[PDB]
Design a protein around this nucleic acid. Structure first.
Ligand SMILES: [Mg+2]
Ligand SMILES: [Mg+2]
Ligand SMILES: [Mg+2]
Ligand SMILES: [Mg+2]
Ligand SMILES: [Mg+2]
Ligand SMILES: [Mg+2]
Ligand SMILES: [Mg+2]
Ligand SMILES: [Mg+2]
Ligand SMILES: [Mg+2]
Ligand SMILES: [Mg+2]
Ligand SMILES: [Mg+2]
Ligand SMILES: [Mg+2]
Lengths: 170, 205, 159, 48, 293
RNA sequence: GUCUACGGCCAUACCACCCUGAACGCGCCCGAUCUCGUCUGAUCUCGGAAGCUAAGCAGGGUCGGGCCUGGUUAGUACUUGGAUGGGAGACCGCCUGGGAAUACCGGGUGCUGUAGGCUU
RNA sequence: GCUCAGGGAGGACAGAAACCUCCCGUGGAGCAGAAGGGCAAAAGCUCGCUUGAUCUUGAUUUUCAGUACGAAUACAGACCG
RNA sequence: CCAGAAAAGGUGUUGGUUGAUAUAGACAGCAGGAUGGUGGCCAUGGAAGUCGGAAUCCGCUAAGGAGUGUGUAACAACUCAC
RNA sequence: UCAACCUAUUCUCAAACUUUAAAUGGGUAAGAAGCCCGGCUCGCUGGUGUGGAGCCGGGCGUGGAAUGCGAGUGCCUAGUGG
């Protein structure tokens, strides 16, 4: 037995594609992950100018989105079924969050278009627990408290218990 | 070309250090301050002798290094190569200025930085030598030879402290047996009765 | 020669004291000032509006005018030969009451009360504050023991 | 032909010869600088 | 490794906020601009109508500030609405209107100005402002305190505001953020505001749920079913509540039951106890070590 | 005994970890039809009550860090005034008054105003 | 309405440094410039609406002779945001 | 004030501190021993204690250093510690 | 291993560093122009003859630390500005 207000549920599944150039391929990848998620994404602009990567300040270089709820669980399950339900334990952060990347987006189950091409994505799961809203509520903000945090071990036990995935070492 | 130290000998000015305002200071003559086997524990050298100054004067960095080498040469002759620890307890921070003429005169008289000079008080320790307790006369003799490199009057005082620590030499080994003091090299660590007692039980483990 | 800036030489004078930077406490904004109140000046760097000048920091004056955010006070500023009773507009958070009048007010209330009292009672009481007199005669009781003998220590050089 | 710049040497002696006297405060100080809406109210209260 | 950020020098140089800013409850920027009476007013009180929406009720107070604290003159809560006829639904917009009307008429009963300054007897939802009349004692004027509520349109804060204004308090406002003000064309129809004051969005949602999916209706509204509130009697129940509030708005205090003096929390440990604890801990450690030897 | 709402002074209140919370509260929580606002009802806004003290919060603990208040450091450092004092000087001693700060060692760990509960 | 500098742990290409997420973060950032002060639900950043950078008589401060100009401080009468 | 002097020294002389050793007979002084393993090992061209690098103990002893100096190509010779 | 790094310590500093923080010093107060009542006026402020301010009227002397001393005020003005 344990208090049911500590059931580890996902808070968000956030996705991005950092294409590193504006215009054609960026709007193309925006159409890609909008076709994936089902909601209009947003454009992340480049902070500082570096000549080594060919990006300048205030240049739109990435497309990201955050998904909540049942469709976040669906997109996570298809990303894990292309990653064969296996993760390295390097993917698990200190705060219990984890994430991975797919190298080409046809693999999730969307159909290829030669005008589009392929695009790789980063998926990142921020986990949670019923009660994390006090860290970002407006009126009476508090810190989360020490026994209510999610650790690396407690996150990977959640993964290998709920999705029946395997955590290969290294 | 360096002026005599009788010019730059009294504590005449407010302390004017190497900083964001005095740029282009030439580096100090002395840069080495500890000598001998400075990798020694507190346990193996109990004895400590101090060259203590007795006039409020200004010592130069070159005089500090000259007296340093003067003590080091005599104690590597006498106490062996690897049997003492010299520490120079004055770092030169007050920099000194020089008005050079070439015919402008005293118009716009503010000096370029020339050197660095330590400012010393009544009773400040200039050098301190830590060695074994039977090499007492060699401490006295080495610091007496090193006196002649400084201006003014300096005296010699063998302290009641155990080496380079702030604790008294008779009760030192009693406190290290009673574990209020922990050896950590040339110094010692003082353990109060105020921590969390996980540290207490890790000491008493 | 020195600059004639309005805030020259006030590096440590209008700065907030250690670990009490930040939002001004609101009792400062809630205190009410009548006219004729003796009031101290202490400028403050958190609000630049209505700053008293550096000649007046620590001077004490008297309110003659109260506006909706500021008070006008008459302070004595000493210039070279003469003392000018000059009037300045200070915003309300650079200013605070003085207890130097309040001690006299407590004393005048107390001695007028004990003048009302003990008048029909026949007695005559002291009202003027006499200064601290010399100590009158008194017996020092050495309860038993000898007084301890003190004598100077021999010199030892400790450094 | 230099000549010295600034001095405040004999000045305190010069001041205290005639004395630094405080400004002679007198009963019924004036009303210049008072809030003029308050002063309109005061003048009508004196009028009526 | 990493430099320890929260070190002892950090805790020496650290400066706390105010207590209510650390606890997050108050906003000292708006509080400073809100409560400070002008200095020529010379200790005239300046009143706030404080509205705070909690998860289960609605606090409506009025207050003027002093140097030792805020004096609450009159309070009116949402949980005392079953005294007047709203049995259930104590945190919606209509309950906000009711507790604003209650705070208003309760203060006017305290100040003896009930028959004077009737205000909106029947509701309209339109703009209203209590204009003070000559000869009689003037209107009570207080300014809204919303706190940390992000005041967009349709805020229950402004529902309690409309309740106090219709009860008869001269509060300065405007009909920009009552519900009904469409943002696209920038005008205010009062009938949408009357629907929100009479809870018709709640009744429409109730009819929506009982039309489309009944077990979700029991999941959403269950205490309405237990207090058998149907959508048709909703606005008539709120009109009865308004009539009863404007009839008798006094607050009678609950009598103080005499305590039995039982402490529910562990008291503060003393010096001899805690130094005895560490003596016992040292003794127990050394005996466990020597018998583990 | 204690909480809420508004607070005053703003660490004796903070920070890290642990134990316990009856009652009413305060919350977490369940949702998006309307008001409102987002890529996303996560936040803000709105409609509620199935579950829960897990977290916030409250109380307490830590030979706790900090902070506050003392003792020591020390009548030491510094210092007003004085000498046809000493010293080649640098500087130092005396007379008359004032008088500190670390390191080190103790104690303390929020008080409290207005309104309203709870402890039938 | 948000929080900054910096740092840790993660995440396809991606790295010392492109983008996403969490956590720490009393200012170690930023506020046009020189420095000093001041500032965290802001004075900083991002938005929305604007023109109090407007019309007008006195008082005062600053340098000061207790005169100007400059700059500034509370007011007061409008018209406004 | 102010009209001239320092570091450094002195077995001139006067005080003061601290530590030794001495009726188990000290410090001078005058006299007698100052020896064996052993000319110890590396090393040097030759280094016998006596230029140099580390060692640096025993026997016999009342006592004698694997040596304080003068020396010797190097021993011899002298001298000291004791 | 040797470096950087991190955690406890340690040696020495600052006119343009600072948590602390003196001595000397700088304002104000130490009453009759002050208290304590009563009543009017207001176009200012106002839940509230609210708040404040201005007025009138009356009563209070033990002149409210020491010390010392007659004060206040207005013209005209030389010399000085190494
Ligand atoms: Mg020469
Ligand atoms: Mg000089
Ligand atoms: Mg000349
Ligand atoms: Mg001249
Ligand atoms: Mg606000
Ligand atoms: Mg929600
Ligand atoms: Mg909880
Ligand atoms: Mg709990
Ligand atoms: Mg502690
Ligand atoms: Mg309370
Ligand atoms: Mg019972
Ligand atoms: Mg703001």
């Amino acid at each position: 037995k344990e208090n049911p207000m500590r059931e580890l549920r996902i808070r968000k599944l956030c996705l991005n594609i950092c294409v590193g150039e504006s215009g054609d391929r960026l709007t193309r990848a925006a159409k890609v992950l909008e076709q994936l998620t089902g909601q209009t994404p947003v454009f992340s602009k480049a902070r500082y100018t570096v000549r080594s990567f060919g990006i300048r300040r205030n240049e739109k270089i990435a497309v990201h989105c955050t998904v909540r709820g049942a469709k976040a669980e669906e997109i996570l399950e298809k990303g894990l079924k292309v990653r064969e339900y296996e993760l390295r334990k390097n993917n698990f952060s200190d705060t219990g969050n984890f994430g991975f990347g797919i190298q080409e987006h046809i693999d999730l189950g969307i159909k290829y278009d030669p005008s589009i091409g392929i695009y790789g994505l980063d998926f990142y799961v921020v986990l949670g627990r019923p009660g994390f809203s006090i860290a970002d509520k407006k009126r009476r903000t508090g810190c989360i408290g020490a026994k209510h945090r999610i650790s690396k071990e407690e996150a990977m036990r959640w993964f290998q218990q709920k999705y029946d995935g395997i955590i290969l070492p290294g | 070309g360096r002026r005599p130290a009788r010019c730059y000998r009294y504590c005449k000015n407010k302390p004017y250090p190497k900083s964001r305002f005095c740029r282009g200071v030439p580096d100090a003559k002395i840069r080495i301050f500890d000598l001998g086997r400075k990798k020694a524990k507190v346990d193996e050298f109990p004895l400590c002798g101090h060259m203590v100054s007795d006039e409020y004067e200004q010592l130069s960095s070159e005089a500090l290094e000259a007296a340093r080498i003067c003590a080091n040469k005599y104690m590597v002759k006498s106490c062996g190569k690897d049997g003492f620890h010299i520490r120079v307890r004055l770092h030169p921070f007050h920099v000194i200025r020089i008005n050079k003429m070439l015919q402008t005169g005293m118009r716009g008289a503010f000096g370029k930085p020339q050197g660095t000079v330590a400012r010393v008080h009544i009773g400040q320790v200039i050098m301190s030598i830590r060695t074994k307790l039977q090499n007492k006369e060699h401490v006295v003799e080495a610091l007496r030879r090193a006196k002649f490199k400084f201006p003014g009057r300096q005296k010699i005082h063998i302290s009641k402290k155990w080496g380079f620590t702030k604790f008294n030499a008779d009760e030192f080994e009693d406190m290290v047996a009673e574990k209020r003091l922990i050896p950590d090299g040339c110094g010692v660590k003082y353990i109060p009765n105020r921590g969390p007692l996980d540290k207490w039980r890790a000491l008493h483990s | 020669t020195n600059t004639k800036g309005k805030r020259r030489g006030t590096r440590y004078m209008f700065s907030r004291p250690f670990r009490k930077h930040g939002v001004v406490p609101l009792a400062t904004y809630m205190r009410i000032y009548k006219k004729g109140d003796i009031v101290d000046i202490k400028g403050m760097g958190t609000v630049q509006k209505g700053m008293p000048h550096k000649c007046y920091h620590g001077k004490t004056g008297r309110v003659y005018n109260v506006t909706q955010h500021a008070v006008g006070i008459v302070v004595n500023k000493q210039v070279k030969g003469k003392i000018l009773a000059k009037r300045i507009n200070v915003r309300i958070e650079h200013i605070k009451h003085s207890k130097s009048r309040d001690s006299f007010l407590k004393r005048v209330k107390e001695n007028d009360q004990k003048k009302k009292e003990a008048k029909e009672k026949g007695t005559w009481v002291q009202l003027k504050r006499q200064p601290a007199p010399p100590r009158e005669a008194h017996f020092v009781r050495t309860n038993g023991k000898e007084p301890e003998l003190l004598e100077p220590i021999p010199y030892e050089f400790m450094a | 032909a230099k000549s010295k710049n600034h001095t405040t040497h004999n000045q305190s002696r010069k001041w205290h010869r005639n004395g630094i006297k405080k400004p002679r405060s007198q009963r019924y100080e004036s009303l210049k600088g008072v809030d003029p809406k308050f002063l309109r109210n005061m003048r009508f209260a004196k009028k009526h | 490794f990493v430099k320890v950020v929260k070190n002892k020098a950090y805790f020496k140089r650290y400066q706390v906020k105010f207590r209510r800013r650390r606890e997050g409850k108050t906003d000292y920027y708006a509080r400073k601009r809100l409560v400070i009476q002008d200095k020529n007013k010379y200790n005239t009180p300046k009143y706030r109508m404080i509205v705070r929406v909690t998860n289960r009720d609605i606090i409506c107070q009025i207050a003027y500030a002093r140097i030792e604290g805020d004096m609450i003159v009159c309070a009116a809560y949402a949980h005392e609405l079953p005294k007047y006829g709203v049995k259930v639904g104590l945190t919606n917009y209509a309950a906000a209107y009711c507790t604003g009307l209650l705070l208003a008429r309760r203060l006017l009963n305290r100040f003896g100005m009930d028959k004077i300054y009737e205000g909106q007897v029947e509701v309209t939802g339109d703009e209203y402002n209590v204009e003070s009349i000559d000869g009689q004692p003037g209107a009570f004027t207080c300014y809204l305190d919303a706190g940390l509520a992000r005041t967009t349109t349709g805020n229950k804060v402004f529902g309690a505001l409309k309740g106090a204004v219709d009860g008869g308090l001269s509060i300065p406002h405007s009909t920009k953020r009552f519900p009904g003000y469409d943002s696209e064309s920038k005008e205010f129809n009062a009938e949408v505001h009357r629907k929100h004051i009479m809870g018709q969005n709640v009744a429409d949602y109730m009819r929506y749920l009982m039309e489309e999916d009944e077990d979700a209706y029991k999941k959403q509204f269950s205490q309405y079913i237990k207090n058998n509130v149907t959508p048709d009697m909703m606005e008539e129940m709120y009109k009865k509540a308004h009539a009863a509030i404007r009839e008798n708005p006094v607050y009678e205090k609950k009598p103080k039951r005499e305590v039995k003096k039982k402490r529910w929390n562990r008291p503060k440990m003393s010096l001899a106890q805690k130094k005895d604890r560490v003596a016992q801990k040292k003794a127990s450690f050394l005996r466990a070590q020597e018998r583990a030897a």
